[PDB]
């Protein structure tokens, strides 16, 4: 439509996603971001990694130039804040008491750094302690990876590992701790954290696992972290800390309008909110997976792009692609990590490839069904394995682990079985 104005609240990738997603689709109408960030809209995973290294440009992170916002016809508002959505007037109210008229509503608001209760007050006011998630935090942190320097990383998960990996090619003293008894223990089998956990040692870092942050020592004049106190009366001397314990989804506005909510905005098969002129996407999204039957919040780019692609279709008169198996990439020490499917509630996990080595394939079962699969420094086989969960394939479990049959031809059989019987 040339005449309805769609409002997009949130900058990350899933917002300018649906907002140049929708130019591309034919939307003729006016298309407004509004995010809090004042930043040009940028990558996120370049912060861990590259970005991080220092070696990438502060340029290249753009996630489109900025003449493209004006070529495109799409107006950014950036550094405003939307504090309430009145669905009646169908307005967006920001911080200064400006009101903007939607005739197409989608909230991006993604999520923000879950908060460390015991580094309240001045300890994660420090600018040696951070958290990371904005474009400042990276550039913060990347400012302080001083060779020989301590840093502790506080959360295990894939975002801790990357950090503590590039902090380790800066040659600094790396310690990561995690309460859980395994790195990754939520969505990982033990074998495959005991390989992360024998990757990083062997790299010099040492993880502490059931290991429980109970407080800080700080400096009087800087107020600076001087070290990290673990439950245990462990003293981890810290020139840098460096927090990650989960993400919680922006959802306020959402709960605030009465939109349904629960551990993210729910939305429908068609990307609506409790109300119909309300839409929402990426990191804040929690929907219904029918390739899993189960409602699922994901964190993810390619999650951000699948659901933005969906959103704009279905604005355009369009039709969406049909849901894919969810997956998504983490890089640590130049090896190359790559997840699809969700492995909650596998029963058991085959290994195909020796877990002595960064090159292997690890299926999670539930029963004969593949869940899941990691696969590291496999892109042939992570590309087959999206078939398989996609379009649940039936392949020969007892030939999973089995290296000398192809995968591919595992996959022309499972497929030859739905045809010919
Ligand atoms: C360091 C790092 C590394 C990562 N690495 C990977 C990776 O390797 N592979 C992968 O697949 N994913 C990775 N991710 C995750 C991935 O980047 C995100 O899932 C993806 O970018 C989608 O983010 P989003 O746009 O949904 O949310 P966000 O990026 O959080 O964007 C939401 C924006 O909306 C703003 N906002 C919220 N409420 C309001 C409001 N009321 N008014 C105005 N603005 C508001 C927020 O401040 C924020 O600026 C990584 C993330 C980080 C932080």
């Given amino acids: 439509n040339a005449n309805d104005n769609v409002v997009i609240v949130g900058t990350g990738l899933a917002g300018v996603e649906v907002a140049f997603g929708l130019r591309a689709s034919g939307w003729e109408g006016n298309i407004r971001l509004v995010g809090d960030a004042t930043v040009i809209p ?76 015991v580094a309240s007050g001045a300890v994660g006011k420090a600018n040696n302690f951070r958290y ?43 310690t990561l701790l995690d309460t859980a008894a395994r790195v990754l223990e939520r969505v990982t089998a033990p074998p495959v954290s005991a390989f992360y956990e024998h990757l990083h040692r062997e790299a010099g870092v040492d993880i502490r696992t059931g290991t429980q942050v109970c407080g800080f020592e700080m400096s009087t004049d800087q107020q600076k972290v001087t070290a990290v106190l673990c439950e245990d009366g462990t003293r981890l001397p810290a020139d840098l800390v460096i927090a990650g314990i989960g993400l919680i989804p922006n959802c306020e506005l959402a709960s605030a309008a009465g939109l349904q909510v629960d551990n993210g905005i729910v939305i429908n098969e068609h990307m609506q909110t409790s109300d119909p002129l309300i839409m929402a996407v990426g990191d804040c999204a929690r929907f219904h997976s029918q390739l899993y039957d189960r409602w699922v919040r994901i964190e993810s780019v390619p999650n951000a792009l699948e659901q933005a692609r969906k959103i704009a279709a279905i604005l355009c008169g369009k039709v969406p692609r049909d849901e894919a198996a969810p997956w998504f990439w983490s890089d640590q020490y130049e090896i190359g990590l790559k997840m699809v499917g969700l492995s909650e509630g596998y029963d058991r996990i085959i290994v195909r490839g020796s877990l002595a080595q960064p090159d292997f394939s690890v299926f999670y079962l539930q029963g004969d069904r593949v869940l899941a699969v990691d696969t590291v420094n496999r892109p042939v086989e992570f590309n087959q394995s999206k078939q398989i969960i996609t379009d649940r394939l039936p392949v020969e479990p007892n030939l999973l682990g089995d290296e000398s049959v192809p995968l591919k031809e595992i996959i022309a059989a499972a497929k030859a079985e739905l045809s010919s019987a």
Avoid: F
């Fill in 42 to 117: 940028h990558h996120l995973p370049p912060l861990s990694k590259a970005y991080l290294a220092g070696k990438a440009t502060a340029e290249s992170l753009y996630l489109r130039t900025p003449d493209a916002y004006a070529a495109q016809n799409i107006q950014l508002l950036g550094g405003t804040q939307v504090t309430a959505i009145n669905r009646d007037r169908q307005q967006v109210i920001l911080s200064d008491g400006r009101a903007l008229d939607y005739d197409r509503l989608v909230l991006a608001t993604g999520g923000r750094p879950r908060p460390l209760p």
């Fill in 132 to 174: 990371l998630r904005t474009l400042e935090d990276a550039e913060c942190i990347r400012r302080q990876l001083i060779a020989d320097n301590r840093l502790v990383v506080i959360g295990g998960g894939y975002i801790g590992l990357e950090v503590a990996a590039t902090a380790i090619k800066a040659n600094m003293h790396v």
